[PDB]
């Protein structure tokens with residue numbers, strides 16, 4: 555029994571250490587590549603930097619803390635840090651999906667009014683966009699959490715809030731539905747709708763020719779970013795709505811799983827950016 559625990563503990567700590575490393579390595583690379591390569595300092599890559607920062611926070615903060623939880627079987631860090639950890643978790647997913655929308659809108663704009671785009675998109679304005687995203691994201695994630703709008707009346711739940719070694723995010727139905735809709739479902743819809751317009755206007759372009767194939771590989775890359783993010787988080791967000799209506803329909807282990815799949819997504823973008831010649835050559839440079 556104490557052997558089964560020691561085996562599991564150490565093998566899990568390892569897998570965990572790996573995912574931390576993969577996320578932090580991958581995203582530092584992306585930030586450095588962009589930071590040190592003028593060729594890669596497009597306005598669009600500013601949003602990528604932002605998205606990589608969200609993933610970076612998941613790597614440095616979110617995953618390590620949740621790893622100690624998954625490994626040791628309790629929250630070691632006390633109540634305040636549990637709330638902060640919970641916030642940083644919600645913040646990141648919110649910032650990611652909002653930044654993806656911005657990216658999709660940037661691309662729709664550049665593809666359908668290259669001239670208006672030219673005289674409306676500047677570095678100074680791209681920074682305002684990024685900050686506004688983080689501002690709205692913080693607004694929507696921190697305040698209700700710090701202000702306890704999320705808590706439940708149930709005595710089983712009240713037992714967990716009092717237990718300083720419990721860090722379970724048991725929420726009332728109102729918050730479950732609300733935060734899901736506000737932080738994920740609405741920007742998910744917006745992003746899809748916009749990304750389908752981008753696809754249309756890109757296919758009503760085909761009918762120099764190499765200039766247009768290079769742009770279309772880049773577009774499809776962003777496409778994959780958005781698709782993969784959706785697959786990594788939608789199963790969690792459906793299961794979240796469903797629990798509000800029936801806690802028996804979907805097994806608990808699968809609810810935990812879908813959340814980790816969510817965290818896993820922060821590892822993926824740097825791999826996907828390898829489709830691009832420039833990133834790949836910058837990745838070889840840096841790693842020496």
Ligand SMILES: CC(C)CCC[C@@H](C)[C@H]1CC[C@H]2[C@@H]3CC=C4C[C@@H](OC(=O)CCC(=O)O)CC[C@]4(C)[C@H]3CC[C@]12C
Nearest residue numbers: 651652655656679682683686687690694736740741744
């Ligand atoms: C909480 C949920 C419901 C919000 C989800 C919506 C966001 C994903 C998107 C939809 C459209 C985006 C907005 C579209 C345009 C802008 C203008 C943009 O930058 C500027 O206006 C710079 C102008 C300047 O100051 O000179 C600021 C961000 C903002 C509000 C964007 C921030 C994110 C928005 C609101």
Ligand SMILES: CCCCCCCCCC(=O)N(CCO)C[C@@H](O)[C@@H](O)[C@@H](O)[C@@H](O)CO
Nearest residue numbers: 694698702703706707726728729732733736
């Ligand atoms: C952007 C996210 C914002 C979400 C804001 C949700 C705030 C709503 C707060 C809320 O709905 N409750 C108080 C929570 O402080 C009610 C719950 O406590 C509920 O458990 C009880 O009223 C039950 O008795 C239901 O019949």
Ligand SMILES: CC(C)NC[C@H](O)c1ccc(O)c(O)c1
Nearest residue numbers: 640643644647723733734737813
């Ligand atoms: C393990 C818990 C803290 N993970 C929370 C999950 O990432 C989440 C993200 C956004 C939400 O709106 C939400 O309710 C829940």
Ligand code: NA
Nearest residue numbers: 714715717720
């Ligand atoms: Na607790």
